[PDB]
Design a protein around this ligand. Structure first.
Ligand SMILES: C[C@H](CCC(=O)NCC(=O)O)[C@H]1CC[C@H]2[C@@H]3[C@H](O)C[C@@H]4C[C@H](O)CC[C@]4(C)[C@H]3C[C@H](O)[C@]12C
Ligand SMILES: C[C@H](CCC(=O)NCC(=O)O)[C@H]1CC[C@H]2[C@@H]3[C@H](O)C[C@@H]4C[C@H](O)CC[C@]4(C)[C@H]3C[C@H](O)[C@]12C
Length: 336
């Protein structure tokens, strides 16, 4: 059963079965798990690295086009939500990273300045893996970032925001949306960290790999995470008003729990995702997708949840928001 056919992250499939009159669900969340894999650039490309250019040429062949194909091509996606936030700035980045002309940057980001955030992350993540997906169907080899190799053994990653209370890098709740970290020359990103680990055990922070070589790659990895957040937020905003698509699943409670897990990925870098996840644990996750949509649109209000009263800290490789002898949110690290 297809859900969100023309979405990138929400794109999911549901298989339902009966074994002696017992109701069984299975939800297959597709593009989402593809998108978060981009925290390990080489692991993402590992697949496509051993597919030739015919993999792409047979796609630009078609006239149907659709979302899943435009994504693979790293092009803007009509029939899907798109953003224009700091599009000017993002186009400059493409030209710098891939060292190409403005005429080619305009292929990725039209004059419209509308683009799919997950189609840029894929582009940059593939770029960090040493493959540039070009304007005209092709894979061109570019230098493989040493950072991408340095992280290619890690199976856990936990992004979080930090500040300083005096002389200690201390985790904080997000104040801003992910969308605001991209602007101002991407200088917001300094206050993001990503903790990687094996097994957490071998915990190593991406900010502790800071080097004049890796600084370029370290920023792109963060940008790709922010962009995948933007995509998720766009699709939830669009899903809210797509009353047609919404009605396919409005009562499928096991799906609300799945959307909750998806937002949890971004609940430490995006204030709206934070508040949205906090509200659902308060309700114990047993929520209709129609009500969940209402909670998503509610979370857009800063006063929706009292973030200011919550104490943030890390323990055991997991992110905790709590107050008054009772935790409100646990966020676990992202697989791969
Ligand atoms: C947390 C502090 C800023 C003080 C603060 O808490 N402000 C929160 C706020 O902006 O509201 C920032 C400012 C300078 C940062 C460092 C510099 O940008 C240089 C360098 C940049 C790297 O992107 C991440 C490591 C780090 C050492 C950074 C770690 C951390 O990112 C620092 C030490
Ligand atoms: C932070 C990284 C790496 C800087 C570095 O090489 N070492 C710094 C150091 O170690 O001292 C740089 C490399 C290319 C930069 C981008 C490009 O120059 C294009 C464009 C230029 C604008 O001035 C600010 C936004 C940005 C997207 C830039 C943001 C950011 O400024 C980038 C992504």
């Amino acid at each position: 059963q297809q859900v969100c056919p023309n979405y990138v992250m929400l794109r999911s499939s549901v298989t339902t079965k009966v074994v002696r009159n017992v109701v069984e669900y299975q939800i297959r969340t597709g593009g989402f798990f593809s998108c978060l894999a981009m925290l390990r650039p080489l692991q993402y490309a590992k697949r496509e690295r051993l597919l030739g250019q015919r993999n792409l040429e047979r796609i630009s062949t078609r006239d149907i086009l659709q979302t899943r194909d435009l994504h693979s091509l790293c092009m803007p996606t009509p029939d899907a939500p798109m953003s224009n936030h700091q599009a000017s700035t993002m186009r400059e980045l493409i030209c710098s990273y891939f060292k190409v002309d403005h005429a080619d940057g305009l292929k990725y980001i039209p004059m419209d300045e509308r683009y799919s955030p997950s189609s840029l992350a894929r582009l940059f993540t593939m770029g960090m893996a040493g493959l540039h997906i070009t304007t005209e169907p092709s894979y061109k080899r570019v230098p493989i970032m040493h950072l991408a190799a340095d992280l290619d053994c890690m199976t856990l990653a936990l992004p979080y925001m930090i500040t300083l209370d005096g002389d200690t890098v201390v985790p904080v709740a997000p104040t801003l949306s992910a969308e605001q970290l991209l602007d101002d020359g991407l200088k917001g990103l300094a206050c993001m960290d990503i903790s990687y680990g094996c097994e957490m055990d071998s915990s190593r922070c991406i900010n502790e790999l800071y080097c004049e070589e890796t600084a370029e790659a370290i920023c792109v990895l963060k940008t790709c995470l922010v962009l995948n957040c933007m995509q998720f937020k766009l699709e939830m905003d669009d899903l809210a008003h797509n009353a047609a698509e919404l009605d396919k699943i409005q009562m499928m409670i096991p799906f609300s729990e799945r959307v909750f897990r998806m937002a949890s990925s971004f609940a430490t870098i995006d204030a709206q995702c934070f508040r949205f996840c906090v509200m659902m644990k308060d309700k114990n996750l047993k929520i209709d997708m129609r009500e969940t949509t209402r909670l998503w649109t509610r979370s857009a209000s800063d006063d929706s949840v009292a973030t200011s009263s919550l104490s943030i800290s890390l323990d055991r490789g997991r992110w905790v928001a709590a107050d008054a002898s009772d935790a409100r949110l646990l966020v676990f690290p992202i697989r791969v």
